[PDB]
């Protein structure tokens, strides 16, 4: 299992020591508050108000907790994953990722805590 | 294990199909938008901007997700626990609860969507 | 022989620890009172003046008892099953399910309480 | 080996020549192009910007190829499988079958050309 901090202002993101094999079953929880540039902050669901004015992750609102397997594209993570299965053919280390536009990182802050393990399958 | 929403307001919670019992590893996923009162809406951690007015939970914001065990009292969930156990003497039926004020959860709206689960121990 | 109980308000139902296997012939008996959102309380098999609004079981009404074997679609149960043998090629554990819409249990309650036996064949 | 096409308006599925059998190691290759309403067209794949409104498959995206072994559950297929063995207990007939939403498969268009071969072990 891998426990540890994303931080917002990481363009880069967070690489863990997971390694996603086919069949894979994973358990996810996140938590913490974060923002994108605002002083407010937000959970690692983001903010449901903010327009997508280029975030890595269409599927996620900016602010929200992202991750790719390997060099998938990115997956939603949200708060969590309850006992979830990648698709197939992806496969590889598991980075997680706060949800913004490229080159906007910068005036980010905070992070989100984070674990993740593999379940009985 | 138990997979379903919670409603923000209803003030009794949500009993579950999982009795806790000394010694059980559970984990819990939340996801989702609900609110107190306002039209805005926040996702399982609360409102962190939020003053306490009498919470059945005061460990966690106000729309927060909380959870009691058999009688005991109230114990924050918020995003969820990953491979958690209770304190000593702590069993019985799991009840979801959204974290708001005895005797105003008739103006709350929306819901959590919630997996619980037990885990290898 | 199984005798448990399923809640109205879980998504996921209950795992009994029957397992279906072909040619077996089974009986099912199901009683109590639920929910899926009003005062009122129905049976096991529901609500037949309810509109189906994408239940997990077209063949059945809103707020009755349905299965699955293994990893099969949902098959009615109501009131239960006498001398009942599947559908060719059905096998695995019987979960029993409340029949509501995915994504609104959060306002169901009550549960039924069901036997499951194997009968001579 | 079968070789042959799988409309995707064919909510039945398409029931190939090829019996499954414990221990067996098969290949499958799938190409061409179908819609499951809009005037565009996707591979095997499937649309990955595509809401899940209900497929028979959850596990794959509105528009791939999917199928099933005997009465199993769906399994993906996507562009294929590769010297694929089939989860335990699953046995029979592979039926292949175009991934859309029960009752919605009247408005859909195209076809996948598939070959499927076992392998040696
Ligand atoms: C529209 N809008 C943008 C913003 O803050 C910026 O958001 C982008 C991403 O969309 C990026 O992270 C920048 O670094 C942020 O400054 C807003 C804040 C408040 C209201 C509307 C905003
Ligand atoms: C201070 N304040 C309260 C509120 O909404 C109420 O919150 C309480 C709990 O603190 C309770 O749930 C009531 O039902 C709500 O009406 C606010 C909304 C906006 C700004 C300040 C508020
Ligand atoms: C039309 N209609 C729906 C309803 O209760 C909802 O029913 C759906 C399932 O169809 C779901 O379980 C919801 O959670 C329920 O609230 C009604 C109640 C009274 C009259 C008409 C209804
Ligand atoms: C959201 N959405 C649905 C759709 O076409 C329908 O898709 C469903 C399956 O989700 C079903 O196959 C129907 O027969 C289709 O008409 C869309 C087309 C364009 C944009 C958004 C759509
Ligand atoms: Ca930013
Ligand atoms: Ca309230
Ligand atoms: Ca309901
Ligand atoms: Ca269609």
Request: with cysteine; hydrophobic share 35%.
């Amino acid at each position: 299992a891998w426990k540890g901090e994303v931080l917002a202002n990481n363009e880069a993101g967070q690489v863990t020591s997971i390694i996603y094999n086919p069949g894979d079953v994973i358990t996810i929880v996140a938590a913490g508050w974060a923002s994108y540039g605002p002083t407010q902050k937000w959970g690692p669901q983001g903010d449901r108000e903010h327009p997508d004015q280029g975030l890595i992750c269409h599927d996620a609102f900016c602010g929200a907790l992202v991750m790719k397997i390997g060099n998938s594209g990115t997956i939603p993570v949200n708060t969590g994953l309850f006992r979830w299965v990648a698709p197939n053919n992806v496969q590889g280390a598991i980075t997680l990722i706060y949800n913004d536009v490229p080159g906007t990182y910068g005036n980010n802050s905070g992070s989100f805590s984070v674990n993740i393990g593999k379940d009985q399958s």
